[PDB]
Design a protein around this motif. Structure first.
Motif, PDB file in Angstrom:
ATOM      1  N   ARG A  77      23.982  -8.516  -9.481  1.00 43.35           N
ATOM      2  CA  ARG A  77      24.515  -7.270  -9.689  1.00 43.35           C
ATOM      3  C   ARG A  77      25.057  -6.869  -8.464  1.00 43.35           C
ATOM      4  O   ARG A  77      24.340  -7.283  -7.086  1.00 43.35           O
ATOM      5  N   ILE A  78      26.170  -6.294  -8.218  1.00 44.12           N
ATOM      6  CA  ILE A  78      26.683  -6.050  -6.991  1.00 44.12           C
ATOM      7  C   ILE A  78      27.377  -4.529  -6.949  1.00 44.12           C
ATOM      8  O   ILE A  78      27.610  -4.220  -7.801  1.00 44.12           O
ATOM      9  N   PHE A  79      26.965  -3.847  -5.850  1.00 44.92           N
ATOM     10  CA  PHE A  79      27.302  -2.527  -5.394  1.00 44.92           C
ATOM     11  C   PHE A  79      28.144  -2.283  -4.400  1.00 44.92           C
ATOM     12  O   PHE A  79      28.784  -1.283  -4.336  1.00 44.92           O
ATOM     13  N   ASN A  80      28.230  -3.098  -3.590  1.00 41.35           N
ATOM     14  CA  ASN A  80      28.814  -3.030  -2.106  1.00 41.35           C
ATOM     15  C   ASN A  80      29.808  -4.220  -1.825  1.00 41.35           C
ATOM     16  O   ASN A  80      29.687  -5.363  -2.425  1.00 41.35           O
ATOM     17  N   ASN A  82      29.034  -5.695   0.936  1.00 39.01           N
ATOM     18  CA  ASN A  82      28.199  -6.369   1.838  1.00 39.01           C
ATOM     19  C   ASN A  82      27.470  -7.211   0.819  1.00 39.01           C
ATOM     20  O   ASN A  82      26.342  -7.782   1.301  1.00 39.01           O
ATOM     21  N   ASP A  83      27.234  -6.930  -0.414  1.00 33.41           N
ATOM     22  CA  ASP A  83      26.500  -7.403  -1.458  1.00 33.41           C
ATOM     23  C   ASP A  83      26.991  -8.905  -1.956  1.00 33.41           C
ATOM     24  O   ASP A  83      26.393  -9.641  -2.465  1.00 33.41           O
ATOM     25  N   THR A  85      28.050 -11.091   0.328  1.00 36.45           N
ATOM     26  CA  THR A  85      27.547 -11.958   1.539  1.00 36.45           C
ATOM     27  C   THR A  85      26.525 -13.004   1.280  1.00 36.45           C
ATOM     28  O   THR A  85      26.823 -14.010   1.949  1.00 36.45           O
ATOM     29  N   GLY A  96      29.127 -12.871 -10.270  1.00 36.78           N
ATOM     30  CA  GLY A  96      28.580 -11.502  -9.972  1.00 36.78           C
ATOM     31  C   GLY A  96      29.389 -10.630 -11.024  1.00 36.78           C
ATOM     32  O   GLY A  96      30.266 -10.755 -11.833  1.00 36.78           O
TER      33      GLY A  96
END
Length: 128
Positions: A77-80, A82-83, A85, A96
């Motif tokens: 799960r991805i929010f940013n 920077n997630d 990386t 993702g």
RNA sequence: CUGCGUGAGCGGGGGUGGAGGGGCGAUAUGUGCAGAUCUUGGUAGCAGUAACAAGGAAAUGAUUUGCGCUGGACGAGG
């Protein structure tokens, strides 16, 4: 590769059983989410012929295919921006997914980063 | 509508909506419902059913004619 031969071991372990609450097809106030019965006359608890079957650990999956996505990868799960990386040494085992509450202004930024890093997105092409 | 989990449950997509919403560790609890002739609110079948009303007429009705029997005053109460 990794996804192709795993997707056919995954299909060997697929069950189509559901585990639905007794009499939930007979009263609307009984909801289909599973509950175990306790009554002194209960026949589901005795496993008689014809009754619904109960859940148990003999249906649980091997550790290597449990929680696999249908296409052969694991979900993250991805929010940013920077997630993404940590998904650089392993970008062939993961897929993702962008959370539902992220807006379209930030979704453009996330979708461009993942293209220049070779990271699959289960969720792109949505709300664009 | 669809994915994952033996399960309790957790995610994603399209409408609607028009302002806020979460993850992880410790901590505080008025912390999880099918039943109690349970409490309060809303709604079915029964059923357009039971029950009740349709008062004698004359195109009109301040005119003509047919029927019923309480009628008029003071006090209490309003």
């Amino acid at each position: 590769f990794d996804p192709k031969p795993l997707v056919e071991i995954k299909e060997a372990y697929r069950k189509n059983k559901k585990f639905i609450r007794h009499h939930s097809d007979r009263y609307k106030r009984v909801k289909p989410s599973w509950r175990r019965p306790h009554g002194i006359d209960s026949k589901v608890r005795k496993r008689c012929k014809g009754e619904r079957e109960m859940p148990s650990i003999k249906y649980k999956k091997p550790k290597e295919i449990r929680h696999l996505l249908p296409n052969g990868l694991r979900k993250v799960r991805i929010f940013n921006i920077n997630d993404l990386t940590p998904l650089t040494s392993l970008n062939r085992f993961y897929c993702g997914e962008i959370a539902h509450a992220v807006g379209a202004r930030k979704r453009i930024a996330i979708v461009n980063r993942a293209k220049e890093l070779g990271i699959c997105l289960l969720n792109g092409n949505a709300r664009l």
